[PDB]
Nucleic acid binder design. Sequence first.
RNA 1: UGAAGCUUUCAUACU
Lengths: 425, 160, 123, 23
Amino acid sequence: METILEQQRRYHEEKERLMDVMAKEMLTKKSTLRDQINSDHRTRAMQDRYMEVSGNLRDLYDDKDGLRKEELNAISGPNEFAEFYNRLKQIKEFHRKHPNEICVPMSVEFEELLKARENPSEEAQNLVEFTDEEGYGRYLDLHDCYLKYINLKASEKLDYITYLSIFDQLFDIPKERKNAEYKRYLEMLLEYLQDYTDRVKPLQDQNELFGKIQAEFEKKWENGTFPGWEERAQRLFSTKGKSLESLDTSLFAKNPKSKGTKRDTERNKDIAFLEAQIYEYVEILGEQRHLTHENVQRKQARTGEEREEEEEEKPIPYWLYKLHGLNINYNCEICGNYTYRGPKAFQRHFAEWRHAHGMRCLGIPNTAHFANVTQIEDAVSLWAKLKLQKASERWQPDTEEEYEDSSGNVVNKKTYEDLKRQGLL
Amino acid sequence: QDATVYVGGLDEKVSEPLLWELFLQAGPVVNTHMPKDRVTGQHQGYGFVEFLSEEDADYAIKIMNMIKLYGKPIRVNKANIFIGNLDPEIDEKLLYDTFSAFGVILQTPKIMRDPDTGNSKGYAFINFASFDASDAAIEAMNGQYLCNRPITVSYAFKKD
Amino acid sequence: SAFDLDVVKLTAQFVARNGRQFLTQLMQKEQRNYQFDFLRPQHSLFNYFTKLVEQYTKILIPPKGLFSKLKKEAENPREVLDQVCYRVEWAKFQERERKKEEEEKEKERVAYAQIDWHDFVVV
Amino acid sequence: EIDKAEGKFWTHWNRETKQFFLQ
RNA sequence: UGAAGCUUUCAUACU
Ligand SMILES: [Zn+2]
């Protein structure tokens, strides 16, 4: 197999087709937010497929460095080419043209008029990754988080506006203790906010953003990210102040700070990382949180009907009728129980198209024998009769013939026309 | 329709038994049909020959194609620019290849057909890429010697 | 049409490894009693065979995957998005140039259909 | 007929030197 | 596409 010649060119053509599909998706205008989110998800899937194809093609270079000495040699050539042509010289009886060598990846990376989705992305749906209250990235669902906060606080003195004001803080004082059970709800709220940020922009590099957030948490947040003018240096894990930078560096490797506490850097590191991720998601998606707060205020200020509307978004002459055999209708089962009108009209009906069609359904030809016959079983019985009659009255030489084979040559004249061939074979 | 062959380009010398006698050497032509006009009461140049087998109709279409019968381009077939008095022996691909020498064609051309026979009506419509190809067709192709039929190219729509 | 496409791909793979324009693995095969009608430029398949030979020559580039590894197209979606935006801008510029050429052709057709063709002067 | 009088086929107009040629 | 029958106060023609 030509893995360096044919497979690399096929991977390059697939990457070029993916880039052309991405350019055609980016050049087209958008009209709705859900269709734009679906197009962004399809572009992210196409970019992931192109990255996987490039990673698969980038690993096919180990044998190429060994085969380049034989491929670039001018002493070789038409011997192996003639051997491959003799291998390609098989029977060409498969008379079938295949124009889908390059048209099939072009049609797989395209959409239809009824549904604007690609062929690998035909099973993708925007309702399986986002809820109806979010609006495909327009707002964020915070009713379950507010219910969990009200269940954890064990008090009914916190509304949605108070929860939105408590969640709007980034570096202020927290509402509860840092060593309490509110960190278990804050980690879930951070894991939901990370999925909401990853769903609001599928075309952005989530791995590079996660690596940058981890680098900012390790190199900056773990080394005093909030300087002061106890107020000079504050620790997020130990929740205590520091006199100077040397005292904080000496206390960073201390025994209560490492593992000798309940909020040290060994056990409470994941909660601090989740709090830093929640702060980064609140700083990056503050406009979506403000839009969700404005939508919650508009839903609270509205009435019941406004909230329901927001959640819902002349006759023939007596002579013609008596003289013409009319007023009498004849029906025929062979013709869909089609009811025909007066004597003369019915007679033609058996010769007309509809009756021939109805008769073909059973497989019986239309002849003069099957006239004035309107029922099915009568037709099939008369067809059996006519078949028996005609088949009888023909001359069938196969069963009707008297051969006397030369096996005994003076006996056995009861041989049919088939046993004679079997004896003479 | 498969066993019948539609003939186009018949003059006044050709008749209904004459086409069956001329098509008798190609195959067993069972019947001949000639639609008469309403204003003149004669044939409009297009007729049909219903044979017994489809192979005889295929041989008549491959043998009597673009023939000069009665001083007319008779041809048998399987039954903004305006071109008139065109020969029925040419197809859409043949007209696209003939129009490709003057200018570039925007798409595949279309030829008008009769509602009864459906082989050839007599006029066709073709669209060019620009007005220069239309002017070259009105200067050169409007009057060029086609296959035994003087065609006439004209503008379909023009604004004064 | 699979056998002819495979023969054209084999000819494009054997012709791309040549060290000269006429000293290839297909010019000597023509004198070796091997019928190859796709080598002549008069056929319509020669335009596809030339594109296949160009793709085989572009598959032998040093950034094509022979002695180097691509990092911008394989490990950066932002670079691919910028390349797609540049391709969309180039397609929009080509469409604008085609519209300007069509407008110039319409202006030339309007000027040619309004000039006086009766003022003839033979010098 | 010895040539072709088409505009887009066998004519040229260099606007840099303002030279018109037709063959 | 088509089916023009029956009757008289008509009126008009032929035996
Ligand atoms: Zn019936």
